[model samples]
Target: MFLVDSHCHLDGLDYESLHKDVDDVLAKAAARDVKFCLAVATTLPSYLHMRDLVGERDNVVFSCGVHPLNQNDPYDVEDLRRLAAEEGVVALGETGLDYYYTPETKVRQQESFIHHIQIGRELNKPVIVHTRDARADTLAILREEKVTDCGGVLHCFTEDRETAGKLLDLGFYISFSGIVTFRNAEQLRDAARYVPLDRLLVETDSPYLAPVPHRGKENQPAMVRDVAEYMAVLKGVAVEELAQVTTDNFARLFHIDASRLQSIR
Candidate 1:
């Protein structure tokens, strides 16, 4: 059964530690047959770093865009567009709204989100979204900007079923992260069960939201199997079937050529 961690922050934590840990992390993921992972960009510096990192590995790919919570600099659409054009850059975000950290920064977040969406529309690349406590605004902007034109994934979704339904209607794939496996996340699990298999994606959002056994600990792509297993039970399907479905969903959503990615086994 092949699996794909549709999104992760492999470059977010201390790079020195990541440099030391990536091999082990990949080794574990390989053991679980987790094939490809997208290392998302949170800022320009990290985006460049992730681009360089992807150059060294075939199984990993990268995205480019500033996060909504990023207050370091003004949004630059042209730069993001140029990075999106890079050979290994497959998607255009980790970009969207986040009212949790700083509600006053809503304007900046919306500006950044629109910039990323525009790049995606121009380049015909999918936009990787990150929404938190700003779903209403996020959906409104996505509609106003016509995000369905280029399509994308609603990465690490933790919203209600109604919100999930809206994103699905917008031609966006709903991705479940490790948080779905938490015992307290009954509502999220219900939403996951409601998502159609074809429109569903899975991620680890690693270095955060580790699944049950690994809860409160650092997350890695390999632990995605735990999520898959739980989801299989939730959907009343075999784990292998669930894995195959999500793997195919990942390849299609990211426009990845399955023939090109080396089989983990």
Candidate 2:
């Protein structure tokens, strides 16, 4: 009964009030059987800050890159290359196009996205993507950049099944966050049903969107269990089965050895 919160912003969690420290947060997660986590980054500074804050742990790994909406200033891809090549950094991004929030920065976002993918290809690491209302450009760029060379996952997916099919064709995995548990997210559920078990993944994107039972409160990695539980019902599988397969998918996508997570238990 192992689960992985495949995407989360560990640095963004409310350590002062909700959590006493990273250990406390992880302890809570361990209680829920959330055995491993990929602490995703939205900016280079945040990536470094998270490393300093969380330090090293066997149950946790990292991804380094800037989010699309976080591009207010120029970003150095060279820094991303150097940092992402670090020992525990498993992926290159939580980066992609997001026309919904900051359409004005679309050009800058595209440039940053390309840099992440190029570095990912060079380093032979997969990328973590976040796309919103920019599917055309997202798919186009993923195709143009030959994202298959390194592989990636579209985290917190909110698109339709057709979009899911297209992304699958490009050899990208789709990760669902707490957003899928919303009452009005039938479309996301449809997409979830459409995605094969092997290509499926789950996350909390925590310190952000909490799932149904824990909605309206600050999310934490511990609540990824709730997300996994709901997904099991959605996929019509046992909770343990859901956790096992998704855990395997996480290991496969990020190139982490599944045995490493099991050993930590």
Candidate 3:
């Protein structure tokens, strides 16, 4: 594929047509032009299992860090640091607060966000962030931590343009998910449209939020093309241009070189 799924759980999809084998899914993704994927982790156990699951597929690099909502599981900075330093960890998180889902975990979520940021800075790896309904605190922590040095993206962003500009100013890229394709996503499209091509990205976040036409179906990596195609219309550009822009943005931000990307094809 010509694009990359900058954020997805290789283990997240359960009912895509390719469920016959994980390789079947991956091949489906490749056939649709998804040249790469970041198999993000939501917990320590998830990281280990995904490591075994991915096993040196150069196109499918992995990330380490517990999700903000997964704090009930045992995790410490040392564990995150140790696990993150292992080979194949190209990024630091799908981390950041999600007050919308689990408001009670706020304090620990804040604590863990800092830990992930610290590890990211030390390792010089970008963090893949997931945030919702805690905009102020989320941006506050991103600023206080001086996250620009390590950089990152606000994956599946649902914020306004102004909020996006704040993260953009901090050198964080913005990744749009299938949500951008919804009829009720005018506000999201506005935010996405406001983001310049250089700092924009696209993702599936699959097994959830499949794009239009496939909206009620299971989201797979292959469906990321639907997102890029829809985003192209919103951005007033050709699909290939949008694909190239997002592909380049994903590669540049994640330190994926051209040959590594091409190897998947």
Candidate 2, residues 152-174, lDDT tens digits: the string is: 99999999999999999988999
lDDT of 1 by residue, 1-265 (tens): 7788888898754346543656667777878888678888789888887666645677888888898888557756777878788888888888888899884988878888888899888888889999999889999999999999889999998998899999999998999998998888888998998999999888899879999888877888887888888888899999888888888877787788877554645
Give me the displacement of residue 133 in model 2, in angstroms: 0.9
As a whole number from 0 to 100, the lDDT of residue 93 in candidate 1 is: 87
Q: Could you arrange the candidates by TM-score from highest to lowest?
A: 2, 3, 1
At residue 243, candidate 1 shows an lDDT of 86
**Top model by TM-score, which number?**
2
Candidate 1: RMSD to truth: 1.9
Assess candidate 1 and give its lDDT: 0.84
Tell me how far the alpha carbon of residue 33 in candidate 3 is from the true structure, in angstroms, after superposition: 1.1
Cα lDDT, all candidates: 0.84, 0.91, 0.87
Residue 209 error, candidate 2, Å: 0.9
Tens-place lDDT per residue, model 3, 1-265, is 3788888888777743548766777888889888778888889888998888768786788889999889876677898999998888889988999988774889999999998999999999989889999999999999999898799999999989999999999999999999998999999999988999999999989878999979898888888988998889999999889888888887788777767766443
Residue 125's lDDT in candidate 1: 84
